[PDB]
Design a protein around this ligand. Sequence first.
Ligand SMILES: *[C@@H]1O[C@H](CO[C@@H]2O[C@@H](C)[C@@H](O)[C@@H](O)[C@@H]2O)[C@@H](O[C@@H]2O[C@H](CO)[C@@H](O[C@@H]3O[C@H](CO[C@H]4O[C@H](CO)[C@@H](O)[C@H](O)[C@@H]4O[C@@H]4O[C@H](CO)[C@@H](O)[C@H](O)[C@H]4NC(C)=O)[C@@H](O)[C@H](O[C@H]4O[C@H](CO)[C@@H](O)[C@H](O)[C@@H]4O)[C@@H]3O)[C@H](O)[C@H]2NC(C)=O)[C@H](O)[C@H]1NC(C)=O
Ligand SMILES: *[C@@H]1O[C@H](CO)[C@@H](O[C@@H]2O[C@H](CO)[C@@H](O[C@@H]3O[C@H](CO[C@H]4O[C@H](CO)[C@@H](O)[C@H](O)[C@@H]4O[C@@H]4O[C@H](CO)[C@@H](O)[C@H](O)[C@H]4NC(C)=O)[C@@H](O)[C@H](O)[C@@H]3O)[C@H](O)[C@H]2NC(C)=O)[C@H](O)[C@H]1NC(C)=O
Ligand SMILES: *[C@@H]1O[C@H](CO)[C@@H](O[C@@H]2O[C@H](CO)[C@@H](O[C@@H]3O[C@H](CO)[C@@H](O)[C@H](O[C@H]4O[C@H](CO)[C@@H](O)[C@H](O)[C@@H]4O)[C@@H]3O)[C@H](O)[C@H]2NC(C)=O)[C@H](O)[C@H]1NC(C)=O
Ligand SMILES: *[C@@H]1O[C@H](CO)[C@@H](O[C@@H]2O[C@H](CO)[C@@H](O[C@@H]3O[C@H](CO)[C@@H](O)[C@H](O)[C@@H]3O)[C@H](O)[C@H]2NC(C)=O)[C@H](O)[C@H]1NC(C)=O
Ligand SMILES: *[C@@H]1O[C@H](CO)[C@@H](O[C@@H]2O[C@H](CO)[C@@H](O[C@@H]3O[C@H](CO)[C@@H](O)[C@H](O)[C@@H]3O)[C@H](O)[C@H]2NC(C)=O)[C@H](O)[C@H]1NC(C)=O
Ligand SMILES: *[C@@H]1O[C@H](CO)[C@@H](O[C@@H]2O[C@H](CO)[C@@H](O[C@@H]3O[C@H](CO)[C@@H](O)[C@H](O)[C@@H]3O)[C@H](O)[C@H]2NC(C)=O)[C@H](O)[C@H]1NC(C)=O
Ligand SMILES: *[C@@H]1O[C@H](CO)[C@@H](O[C@@H]2O[C@H](CO)[C@@H](O)[C@H](O)[C@H]2NC(C)=O)[C@H](O)[C@H]1NC(C)=O
Ligand code: NAG
Ligand code: ZN
Length: 608
Amino acid sequence: LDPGLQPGNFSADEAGAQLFAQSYNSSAEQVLFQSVAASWAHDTNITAENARRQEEAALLSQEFAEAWGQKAKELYEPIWQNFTDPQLRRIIGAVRTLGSANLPLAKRQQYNALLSNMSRIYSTAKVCLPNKTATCWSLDPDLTNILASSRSYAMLLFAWEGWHNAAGIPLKPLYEDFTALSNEAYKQDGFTDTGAYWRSWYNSPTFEDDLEHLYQQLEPLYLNLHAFVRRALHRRYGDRYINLRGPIPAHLLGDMWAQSWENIYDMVVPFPDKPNLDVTSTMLQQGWNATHMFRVAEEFFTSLELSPMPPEFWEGSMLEKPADGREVVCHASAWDFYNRKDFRIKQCTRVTMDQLSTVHHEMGHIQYYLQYKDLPVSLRRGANPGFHEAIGDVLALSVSTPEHLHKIGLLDRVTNDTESDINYLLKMALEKIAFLPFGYLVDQWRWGVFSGRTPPSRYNFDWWYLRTKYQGICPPVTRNETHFDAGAKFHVPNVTPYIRYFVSFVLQFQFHEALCKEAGYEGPLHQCDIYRSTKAGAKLRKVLQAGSSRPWQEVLKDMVGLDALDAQPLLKYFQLVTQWLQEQNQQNGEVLGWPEYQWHPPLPDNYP
Ligand SMILES: *[C@@H]1O[C@H](CO[C@@H]2O[C@@H](C)[C@@H](O)[C@@H](O)[C@@H]2O)[C@@H](O[C@@H]2O[C@H](CO)[C@@H](O[C@@H]3O[C@H](CO[C@H]4O[C@H](CO)[C@@H](O)[C@H](O)[C@@H]4O[C@@H]4O[C@H](CO)[C@@H](O)[C@H](O)[C@H]4NC(C)=O)[C@@H](O)[C@H](O[C@H]4O[C@H](CO)[C@@H](O)[C@H](O)[C@@H]4O)[C@@H]3O)[C@H](O)[C@H]2NC(C)=O)[C@H](O)[C@H]1NC(C)=O
Ligand SMILES: *[C@@H]1O[C@H](CO)[C@@H](O[C@@H]2O[C@H](CO)[C@@H](O[C@@H]3O[C@H](CO[C@H]4O[C@H](CO)[C@@H](O)[C@H](O)[C@@H]4O[C@@H]4O[C@H](CO)[C@@H](O)[C@H](O)[C@H]4NC(C)=O)[C@@H](O)[C@H](O)[C@@H]3O)[C@H](O)[C@H]2NC(C)=O)[C@H](O)[C@H]1NC(C)=O
Ligand SMILES: *[C@@H]1O[C@H](CO)[C@@H](O[C@@H]2O[C@H](CO)[C@@H](O[C@@H]3O[C@H](CO)[C@@H](O)[C@H](O[C@H]4O[C@H](CO)[C@@H](O)[C@H](O)[C@@H]4O)[C@@H]3O)[C@H](O)[C@H]2NC(C)=O)[C@H](O)[C@H]1NC(C)=O
Ligand SMILES: *[C@@H]1O[C@H](CO)[C@@H](O[C@@H]2O[C@H](CO)[C@@H](O[C@@H]3O[C@H](CO)[C@@H](O)[C@H](O)[C@@H]3O)[C@H](O)[C@H]2NC(C)=O)[C@H](O)[C@H]1NC(C)=O
Ligand SMILES: *[C@@H]1O[C@H](CO)[C@@H](O[C@@H]2O[C@H](CO)[C@@H](O[C@@H]3O[C@H](CO)[C@@H](O)[C@H](O)[C@@H]3O)[C@H](O)[C@H]2NC(C)=O)[C@H](O)[C@H]1NC(C)=O
Ligand SMILES: *[C@@H]1O[C@H](CO)[C@@H](O[C@@H]2O[C@H](CO)[C@@H](O[C@@H]3O[C@H](CO)[C@@H](O)[C@H](O)[C@@H]3O)[C@H](O)[C@H]2NC(C)=O)[C@H](O)[C@H]1NC(C)=O
Ligand SMILES: *[C@@H]1O[C@H](CO)[C@@H](O[C@@H]2O[C@H](CO)[C@@H](O)[C@H](O)[C@H]2NC(C)=O)[C@H](O)[C@H]1NC(C)=O
Ligand SMILES: *[C@@H]1O[C@H](CO)[C@@H](O)[C@H](O)[C@H]1NC(C)=O
Ligand SMILES: [Zn+2]
């Protein structure tokens, strides 16, 4: 520990604690920058040298959070709740959280080693065909691509069986040990369990109830969608393997976790005679290039009179693919270095209509970072953890439209045909609405484990209960408590909350509606854009400047006017497809929901 990074002495006063907050701030951006700089380099190009620097940076960060966290508890754990500023209470409350650093070394060293071991066995999971094969598969590319692409039911089944079998089972012992150790650490931090810690972020005493009220508002839309897809699969696979009343076999939905079904959009799409618009042909013809694209993105924000990208951003960012042959993580990401001056993007840009849209949300994050850089570093995070991605997405929504592309000049004429825009809304539904029930059930399920209400003998039973209950899926081959299908997801062994994403996808439209309402727009909400609309920016800026200083429920209210989440706006946005599906289901007599829930298909005749 560098002494300039090691806390001093502070009184039990607020007057002292204000000085503690100030000192933590000044040290914090000096450590966090050094940490993120290393992590930036490692990700900007892989080298074992940079991986080492990455590893050392990780240790240096934890060592810093520890050295301050221990004193924050030692001096202010008896007090912090008392302090007059809700901003300061937020500052100290964040520092005062220690997480795993509560565990004594013996447990601590098991804990880290245990968490890493889960990630290893998941990331390095494998499936092998039932021969003396030279070669096995892995989740990507082999499994993701066979599962999404092929539709011979047996082959599709085996791929799903192998994965949840191989990825889950060897996790089963580890995840229990994690659950115990996880809760024990937070117990000392001040939470009943890890689950009550995660829910602590949304600072809502009624949080879990709020979700069910939201999800109940979605269920008519989701059931409408689910019931529609279910019929389509019946056309394809046969009467033996689908029940027009029952739930859907989990592996037919085109995705290993059935969390988003878009890979059956090719099979289901409405109005097969219409195209789906691709503006790439203009963009290449215009001589657009990656470097230019961001200036369009910046144009948008400047058009809202949000802040332009500072010169440092143009000096630093890796907008284009590198000139070297060096290996790089191409997946697009946006970075804030807690050093106030320089913000950074990595995009690996390929000039296509899709990545044009993608750049806008990635720059959206940068605009978000730019606005709250003025806060003390402890607060420089989204008003709540899903709130940051929402401000990212509302931007991509607007520009994805044909309406905005015409103001960009990339589109020649607007073509207001509902058959086309239904195609667009429906594919987006198969992407994101299918995700809401899944995103909801996981963190109910994990809360079930962390609260203990799912003891280890029920990990798998409570999982499939939650799947059929919410997502309308059932397992393709009988699954029993030796298996552990909850582990087969990325976010479970990586102990990463999904609930942020669900909260975000509701805040997304709850903003978009409140912006388009403010931007003077009227008409079909998916045809709104806010570009050039200074009225939207000035209100949007008020959200971004708040960062996390002000409780999100108060900030959201100041933007939208509602003290809480609501899915009515989301239903407004999807309204056109909502109506269309209701017609199509009514025409087919399709039974919404899934009675005969106690059904799942027989096995293929010679399996395998
Ligand atoms: C990615 O795309 C970027 C943008 O490209 C342009 O725009 C897009 C939409 C497409 O249409 C592209 O095809 C198009 O090229 C590229 O940056 C641009 O690169 C080109 C070529 O390298 C630049 O063109 C050259 O610019 C010189 C400077 O011209 C400006 O400054 C003069 C003073 O020096 C001034 O007198 C001019 O009026 C001009 O001012 C610009 O005005 C327009 C509006 O009228 C603004 O939009 C600009 O921002 C203004 N820029 C400034 C600095 O004020 C010219 O001297 C030069 O002409 C000479 O060279 C050409 C060959 O290049 C000869 O053919 C010609 O005869 C003459 O001798 C030429 O115009 C362009 O300026 C760059 N953009 C900017 C903003 O500077 C990226 O390089 C590209 N990257 C990749 C990898 O593709
Ligand atoms: C969390 O902790 C950070 C870091 O300690 C605090 O930032 C510091 O806050 C104070 C108060 O806002 C700020 O002082 C003001 O800075 C303005 C710019 O001052 C710069 O120029 C003068 C000369 O004109 C220098 O004397 C200063 O040291 C500054 O120097 C420049 O700083 C930038 C930013 O880091 C750096 O990139 C440049 O390299 C450097 N210049 C050169 C030539 O190297 C003044 O206009 C104003 O009057 C005040 O002096 C101080 O500069 C901040 N430092 C940094 C590093 O950001 C945060 O305030 C704190 N958080 C909160 C919420 O308080
Ligand atoms: C990924 O990005 C990083 C940052 O841009 C980049 O880092 C540099 O990589 C090169 C090698 O490709 C390093 O060069 C050598 O590093 C070794 C130690 O690992 C040193 O022994 C070498 O010392 C000589 O060169 C010095 C100047 O670099 C001289 O001052 C010295 O006297 C010796 O003559 C040499 O430094 C370089 O150090 C790193 N730098 C950093 C900051 O990481 C890396 O190259 C990129 N990846 C790829 C594949 O290019
Ligand atoms: C932060 O506050 C602490 C507690 O008020 C200060 O700690 C004290 O620091 C002095 C030196 O400034 C230490 O002196 C040592 O005392 C022992 C005898 O106990 C002697 O053998 C050593 O040679 C040395 O003189 C003292 O131990 C230490 N006491 C405690 C309880 O921490 C500290 O000075 C303050 N920080 C700063 C930067 O001033
Ligand atoms: C994380 O997973 C790894 C791998 O499963 C665990 O490390 C393994 O630990 C065992 C002993 O605990 C090692 O087996 C022993 O090896 C020695 C020779 O080194 C041998 O004499 C013993 O009879 C026994 O076979 C095993 O080699 C070791 N594997 C690796 C790769 O290190 C680790 O304990 C797990 N940690 C947690 C927290 O789960
Ligand atoms: C939960 O369901 C699984 C199947 O999905 C059951 O596991 C399977 O049980 C049978 C009977 O023991 C195993 O067959 C045996 O395999 C061994 C080779 O491993 C072979 O030597 C025997 O002759 C016999 O064929 C089968 O392999 C096994 N599968 C797995 C993946 O373990 C399990 O029994 C069910 N749970 C409970 C509690 O019964
Ligand atoms: C910190 O907590 C204490 C205890 O809840 C508060 O002290 C009490 O304050 C009320 C009026 O605010 C008095 O009627 C009590 O007599 C006080 N009790 C004691 C033991 O002093 C204190 O006000 C809180 N501080 C803040 C800033 O809210
Ligand atoms: C598209 O045409 C319909 C015609 O009924 C109209 O109601 C709708 O508002 C048009 N789109 C926009 C963005 O105005
Ligand atoms: Zn994002």
